[PDB]
C-alpha cells in the first residue's frame, strides 16, 4: 500500500536567487552644506544657447581618431 500523494513546500527564494535589497546602504537625511572657500564672482556675457551651441560644435570635426597622434608631438 501507499499514502495519498503530497505537495511539496518549496521556496520562492531559491536561496538568494531573489533578494529585494533595502534602501539602507547609507545613512538617511544627510543634507550637507558646501563649506567652500573660493566662491568668487563670475562674468556676464551673451550665452550660446541650445541652438547656438551646436553651431560652434559644427565647425569642429576634430580629426578621425588621430588626436592621440598629435598628443606626443608637443
Amino acid at each position: 500500500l501507499a499514502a495519498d500523494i503530497e505537495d511539496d513546500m518549496l521556496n520562492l527564494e531559491d536561496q538568494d536567487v531573489v533578494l529585494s535589497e533595502d534602501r539602507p546602504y547609507g545613512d538617511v537625511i544627510d543634507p550637507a552644506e558646501s563649506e567652500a572657500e573660493a566662491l568668487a564672482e563670475l562674468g556676464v556675457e551673451e550665452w550660446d544657447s541650445y541652438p547656438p551651441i551646436d553651431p560652434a560644435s559644427r565647425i569642429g570635426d576634430d580629426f578621425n581618431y588621430v588626436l592621440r597622434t598629435e598628443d606626443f608631438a608637443e
Binding site: A2, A3, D4, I5, E6, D7, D8, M9, L10, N11, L12, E13, D14, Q15, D16, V17, V18, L19, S20, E21, D22, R23, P24, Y25, G26, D27, D30, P31, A32, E33, S34, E35, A36, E37, A38, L39, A40, L42, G43, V44, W47, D48, Y50, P52, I53, D54, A56, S57, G60, D62, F63, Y65, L67, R68, E70, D71, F72, E74
Partner: protein, 1018 residues
C-alpha cells in the same frame, strides 16, 4: 594671448555644455524606462538583472548614444589645443586667469564624468597649477593617490598651500604615501591612519569637505592590509579591506545626494532626475563647480566599482551580486558609455567567475549584452572614436573581447599585445601629468586591474583543462607578472593570485595514483616551496578567494608532513563565510580569523574533544578531492580520493536522480496515488544502490576511514609504532595510529588495500607486503583487550548536496552529523568553552520558539504541525512573520528554534536580523533545500543561507538538502522531536525516524544536521 584663449574657452564650453546637455537627454531617456521596467519606487533584486539587460539595450539603441561620439573627439582636440596654449595661459598673471579657470574646469567635468581618468586628473592638476582652488586641490589630491602615483604627489604636496581645512586632509595622504614607500614606516603610519579613520567618524559635522575626506580616508585604509606581514607587523592589527570600502562607498554615496540626488547608489526611488544639466539653481558660469560635480560623481563610480571588484575577489557572493547590479543602474542613470561598460563587463565577468549557481542563464543574457553595447545597430563608428583616446576604455573593449571569446589562449595573446599598444598610445596624457620626460609612467590602475582580472580568469581555465605546454604561455605570463607588479600594494588580489596560478602552471602535481582513475626536477620543486612557506607565513591576513584557494590547497597537496597539510586545507575553505566575520570585527589581524601558523593550529585540534573527529573532504587547487581526517590523538590523515571528473560524474548522475524527485513533486499532473509512490520508490531504491556504488567506485576502500576515531589504547599503541617502524617510512605514525584502530571494523582485504594505499604515495616496500596480513591478525588481538563518538563532515560545497551522512558504512552507525567549516567548529567549540556548555547541548524544548507557515499559503501542513505543538507549550506566531525585533529576541532568549515554513529565512528571518543578534538557539529549518548549498565555483563556498547562521554562531542547524514532499518532512519532524524525550540524541533521533520514514534515502537522507549535537535536557 587672449586672442585664441577667449575663442577656445567659448569652444570648450560649447563642447562641454553640448555634451552635458547631450547625455542629459540620454539620462532622461532611461528615466522613461526605469518607471516602465522597475517602477516609480519599485524593488530591485538579483532577478532585476534580466530587466537591466533591457535598459542597456534601449540605452544603446536610442538615437542619442551615437551622438556623443562627436562630443568625445571634439573635447579631445580641446585638450590637445589646450596643452599647446597652456604655456600662455600660465603667463597671463592677471585676474583674467579667473575667467581662464573654466578652460580645464569645463574639461574636468568632461573626462571625470566620462571616466577618462588619465586625461581627467591632468587638466584638474593643471586647474590647480592655474587657479589654485582650495576645494579642487582637495579633489586633485585624491585622484593622484587613486592612480597610485607615488612620485608625483611628492612634488605637488610641498608646493601647494595647506590651510586649516586642508592640512587635516593633506596629512591623510602623507600617512598613506609614506606607508607604501618605506617598510619601516608601516607600523608608525598605520596608527596615524587608524587614529584618523576614527577621527573623522567621531566628528558629527555635516561638511561636504569633511565627507569628501570621510570616503577618501576610508579608501586609504581599505587597501592598507595588502602588505607582507613581518615580525613587526604581526602584533599590530590591520583594517580590513572589505568592511569599510562599503563605508568608503557609503560616504562617497552621501556626497552625491547633496549635489545630484539621482546618481546615488543607495537611491532606489528613481523618480528623481539624475540630471546634471540644471547644476543646482545656477553654476552655469561657475568654474569650481564643474570640478566639484565632475570629481565627486567620478569618485562615486570609482568606489562603487571598487566595492564591486573587491567582492568578486573576497568570495562575498552576496555583497558582490547586489553591489554589481546597483553599480550598473547608477551607471545607466549617468548614461556614460564608459561607466556603463565598466560595469556591464563585470556582470558578464562575475557570471563567468561563479558557475553552476543558476547563472548559466545570467551570463548568456549579460555576456551578449556587453557585445550588444559595443557593436553598431543594437538589438566601429562610436566605439572606435573613444577606443584610441581613452586609455581605460581600451582595456574595457578588449576585456569584452575576452568575455565574448570566453577567455581563450589566443584572446589573451590578443590582449597581451594590445596592452602594450594602449600604454604606449595613452602614454602622452600620462606624461603631461608629470611635466617631466625623465620619469616613466606606470599603466592606468583601472587598466592594470582589468589586465589582472583577465589573465587570472584565463589561468584558471588553463588549470581546468590541465596543460602548460607552450612557451608562449610563459611569455604571456612573464609579461602578465610585470604588468601587475607596478603597485605592490592596492592590487595584491591580482598580484598574489597570478603568481600562484603561474606557479601551479609550471608545477601541476597531478599525482596519478592507482585509485584515482580519471574518466572522460626536485631542485625546481623546492625553489617554489621555499617561497610558498614564506607566502603562507607572510600574507596570512589576506583572505582573497583566488589566491587563498589556490595556494593553501596546493601546499596541502604537496607537503611532506601531515600537520602542515591540515592547517593548509582548513584555511583554504569557506572564504565568503570568514570575510563577513572579518567585516563584523571590522579589523583584521594575523590570528583572529586565520590561525597563526601550524603551532597554534595543532593546539586547538588537541583541545578538540576525544569523541569529536572531523573528516573533511575538500577540493584542491587542481580540482581533485582530497580527504583530510583530523583528530586529537592522531596526526591528520590526508589521502586523495578522486579527480574532478569522477566527482562530476558523481554529481551529474545524482542531481539527474534528484531532478526526478523535483519533477515529480513540482509536476505530478494527474498521476494515480499508488504510481506516485511506486515510480520514485525504485528511484529511492536506486539510491539504495547508488551510495553502494559511491562507497565502491568513488571513495572505494577509503570509505571505511570515515568512521570516527577514538583514543588508541596504550597496550595497543605499542603496535601502531611497530606498524610505523616496520613500514620503513611508508606510513607515518598518526596515519598508522588509526589503521590499527579502524582494523576491527573493516575487512581483511580492505585493510590490506588501504595501508598499501598509503604506501603508494611514499616509497612502498616489498618486504612489508609479505609480512602485511600478520599486522591485521595482531591488530584484532590488541583492540579487543584495550561513548557516543561523532564523525563530523566538512564537505566541499561541490559535493555538499549529496547525503554524505547516509553511506553503507553508516547504516549501523548513526552518529554522523555534519559541519560547515573546520575553523567554524573551533569558534563553535570555544564558545561552548566560554559558556562552559556540555559538548552535546541540553535543550528544554518546552519554551522553544517556532515559526509555522507564514502568509497562510501552505495549507494543512500549517494545521498538521500545530497539532504537535498543541501537545507542547511553545511560543510563536502562525500565518505571519511577527517582526524582526521578535526574531532577534527569539534566537537570543529561547533555547531552540523551529521553522516549518517555506524555504529558509526568506521573509521571516533575512540576513538583516541574523547580523544584529547572536544565536544560542538551535535552529530547526524545514523546507525543500533549507541547507542546500548551490555549488558555486572553487573558493566561493557555495550559495546558501547556512553561512548566515555560521556567522551568527548558531550551535546546530537541522536542515534539508533538496526538494522534499511537505507531508513526509512534517511526518519526519513529529517523529524526531518525539524521539528526543519519549540518552537518545538528535543524530540518533534522525536515524530512528529513518526507520519510520516511508522512503529510505530519497526523503530521509535529506535531513542533515550542521553543528554540535542535541541531547535532551531532563
Amino acid at each position: 594671448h587672449i586672442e585664441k584663449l577667449d575663442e577656445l574657452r567659448k569652444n570648450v564650453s560649447c563642447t562641454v555644455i553640448g555634451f552635458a546637455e547631450q547625455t542629459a537627454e540620454l539620462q532622461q531617456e532611461i528615466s522613461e524606462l526605469f518607471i516602465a521596467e522597475f517602477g516609480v519606487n519599485g524593488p530591485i533584486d538579483m532577478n532585476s538583472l534580466s530587466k537591466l539587460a533591457r535598459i542597456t539595450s534601449y540605452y544603446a539603441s536610442s538615437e542619442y548614444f551615437q551622438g556623443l561620439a562627436k562630443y568625445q573627439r571634439t573635447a579631445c582636440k580641446m585638450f590637445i589645443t589646450w596643452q599647446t596654449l597652456r604655456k600662455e595661459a600660465m603667463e597671463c598673471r592677471s585676474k583674467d586667469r579667473e575667467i581662464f579657470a573654466s578652460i580645464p574646469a569645463k574639461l574636468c567635468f568632461f573626462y571625470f564624468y566620462n571616466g577618462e581618468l588619465c586625461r581627467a586628473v591632468v587638466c584638474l592638476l593643471d586647474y590647480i597649477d592655474l587657479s589654485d582652488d582650495t576645494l579642487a586641490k582637495e579633489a586633485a589630491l585624491r585622484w593622484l593617490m587613486f592612480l597610485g602615483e607615488t612620485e608625483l604627489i611628492e612634488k605637488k604636496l610641498k608646493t601647494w598651500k595647506m590651510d586649516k581645512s586642508s592640512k587635516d586632509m593633506f596629512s591623510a595622504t602623507e600617512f598613506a604615501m609614506n606607508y607604501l614607500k618605506k617598510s619601516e614606516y608601516r607600523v608608525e603610519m598605520l596608527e596615524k591612519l587608524m587614529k584618523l579613520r576614527d577621527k573623522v567618524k567621531s566628528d558629527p559635522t555635516r561638511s561636504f569637505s569633511r565627507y569628501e575626506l570621510a570616503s577618501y580616508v576610508s579608501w586609504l585604509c581599505s587597501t592598507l592590509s595588502n602588505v607582507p606581514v613581518g615580525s613587526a607587523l604581526r602584533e599590530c592589527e590591520f583594517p580590513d579591506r572589505v568592511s569599510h570600502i562599503q563605508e568608503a562607498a557609503l560616504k562617497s554615496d552621501s556626497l552625491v545626494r547633496n549635489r545630484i540626488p539621482g546618481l546615488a547608489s543607495s537611491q532606489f526611488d528613481n523618480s528623481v532626475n539624475a540630471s546634471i544639466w540644471p547644476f543646482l539653481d545656477g553654476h552655469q558660469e561657475d568654474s569650481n563647480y564643474y570640478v566639484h560635480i565632475g570629481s565627486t560623481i567620478a569618485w562615486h563610480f570609482e568606489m562603487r566599482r571598487e566595492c564591486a571588484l573587491v567582492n568578486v575577489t573576497t568570495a562575498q557572493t552576496r555583497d558582490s551580486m547586489s553591489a554589481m547590479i546597483l553599480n550598473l543602474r547608477v551607471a545607466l542613470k549617468s548614461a556614460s558609455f564608459f561607466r556603463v561598460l565598466q560595469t556591464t563587463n563585470t556582470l558578464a565577468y562575475y557570471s563567468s567567475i561563479i558557475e553552476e549557481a543558476g547563472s548559466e542563464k545570467n551570463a548568456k543574457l549579460m555576456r551578449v549584452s556587453c557585445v550588444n553595447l559595443l557593436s553598431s545597430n543594437p538589438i566601429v563608428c562610436n566605439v572606435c572614436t573613444i577606443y584610441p583616446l581613452h586609455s581605460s576604455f581600451a582595456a574595457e573593449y578588449m576585456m569584452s573581447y575576452a568575455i565574448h571569446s570566453d577567455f581563450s589562449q589566443l584572446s589573451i595573446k590578443h590582449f597581451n599585445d594590445e596592452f602594450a599598444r594602449i600604454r604606449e598610445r595613452g602614454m602622452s596624457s600620462q606624461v603631461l601629468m608629470h611635466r617631466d620626460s625623465s620619469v616613466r609612467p606606470r599603466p592606468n590602475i583601472i587598466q592594470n586591474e582589468i589586465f589582472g582580472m583577465c589573465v587570472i580568469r584565463w589561468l584558471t581555465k588553463k588549470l581546468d583543462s590541465k596543460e602548460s605546454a607552450d612557451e608562449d604561455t610563459m611569455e604571456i605570463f612573464n609579461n602578465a607578472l610585470k604588468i601587475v607588479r607596478y603597485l605592490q600594494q592596492r592590487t595584491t588580489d591580482m598580484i598574489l593570485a597570478v603568481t600562484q596560478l603561474g606557479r601551479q602552471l609550471e608545477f601541476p602535481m597531478e599525482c596519478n595514483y592507482s585509485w584515482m582513475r580519471p574518466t572522460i626536477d626536485k631542485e625546481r620543486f623546492e625553489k617554489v616551496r621555499l617561497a610558498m612557506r614564506n607566502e603562507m607565513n607572510h600574507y596570512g591576513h589576506i583572505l582573497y578567494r583566488e589566491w587563498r584557494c589556490r595556494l593553501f590547497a596546493y601546499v596541502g597537496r604537496t607537503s611532506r608532513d601531515p600537520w602542515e597539510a591540515a592547517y593548509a586545507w582548513a584555511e583554504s575553505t569557506q572564504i565568503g563565510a570568514r570575510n563577513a566575520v572579518q567585516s563584523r570585527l571590522e579589523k583584521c589581524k594575523r590570528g583572529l580569523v586565520t590561525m597563526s601558523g601550524h603551532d597554534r593550529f595543532k593546539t586547538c585540534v588537541q583541545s578538540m574533544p576525544d569523541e569529536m573527529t572531523l573528516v573533511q573532504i575538500a577540493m584542491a587547487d587542481d580540482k581533485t578531492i582530497y580527504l583530510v581526517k583530523l583528530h586529537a590523538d592522531r596526526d591528520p590523515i590526508i589521502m586523495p580520493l578522486a579527480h574532478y571528473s569522477q566527482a562530476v560524474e558523481l554529481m551529474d548522475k545524482f542531481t539527474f536522480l534528484l531532478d526526478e524527485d523535483e519533477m515529480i513533486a513540482k509536476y505530478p499532473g494527474d498521476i494515480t496515488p499508488e504510481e506516485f509512490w511506486k515510480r520514485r520508490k525504485i528511484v529511492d531504491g536506486r539510491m539504495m544502490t547508488f551510495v553502494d556504488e559511491v562507497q565502491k567506485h568513488f571513495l572505494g576502500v577509503a570509505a571505511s576511514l570515515l568512521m570516527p576515531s577514538g583514543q588508541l589504547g596504550p597496550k595497543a599503541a605499542e603496535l601502531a609504532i611497530k606498524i610505523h617502524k616496520l613500514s620503513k617510512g611508508g606510513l607515518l605514525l598518526g596515519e598508522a595510529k588509526e589503521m590499527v584502530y579502524q582494523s576491527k571494523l573493516m575487512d581483511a582485504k580492505s585493510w590490506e588495500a588501504l595501508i598499501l594505499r598509503f604506501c603508494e604515495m611514499r616509497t612502498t616496500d616489498e618486504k612489508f607486503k609479505s609480512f602485511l596480513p600478520l599486522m591485521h591478525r595482531n591488530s584484532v588481538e590488541v583492540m579487543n583487550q584495550d561513548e557516543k563518538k561523532y564523525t563530523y563532515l566538512v564537505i566541499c560545497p561541490h559535493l555538499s548536496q549529496f547525503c554524505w551522512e547516509r553511506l553503507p558504512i553508516f547504516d549501523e552507525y548513526p552518529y554522523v552529523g555534519r559541519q560547515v567549516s573546520i575553523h567554524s567548529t573551533f569558534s563553535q567549540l570555544e564558545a561552548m568553552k566560554s559558556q562552559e556548555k556540555q559538548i552535546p547541548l541540553q535543550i528544554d524544548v518546552q519554551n522553544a520558539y517556532y515559526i509555522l507557515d507564514p502568509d497562510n499559503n501552505l495549507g494543512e501542513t500549517q494545521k498538521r504541525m500545530v497539532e504537535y505543538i498543541n501537545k507542547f507549550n511553545w511560543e510563536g506566531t502562525v500565518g505571519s512573520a511577527p517582526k524582526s525585533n521578535e526574531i532577534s529576541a527569539a534566537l537570543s532568549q529561547r533555547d531552540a528554534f523551529f521553522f516549518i515554513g517555506h524555504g529558509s529565512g526568506s521573509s521571516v528571518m533575512p540576513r538583516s536580523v541574523l547580523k544584529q543578534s547572536t544565536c544560542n538557539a538551535i535552529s530547526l529549518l524545514m523546507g525543500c533545500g533549507s541547507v542546500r548549498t548551490i555549488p558555486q565555483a572553487l573558493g566561493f563556498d557555495g550559495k546558501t543561507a547556512i553561512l548566515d547562521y555560521a556567522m551568527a554562531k548558531c550551535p546546530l542547524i537541522v536542515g534539508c538538502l533538496w526538494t522534499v514532499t511537505d507531508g513526509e518532512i512534517d511526518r519526519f519532524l513529529i517523529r524526531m522531536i518525539d524521539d528526543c524525550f519519549e540518552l537518545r540524541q538528535l543524530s540518533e533521533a534522525m536515524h530512528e525516524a529513518r526507520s519510520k520514514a516511508r522512503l529510505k534515502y530519497l526523503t530521509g537522507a535529506a535531513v542533515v544536521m550542521y553543528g554540535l549535537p542535541v541531547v535532551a535536557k531532563q
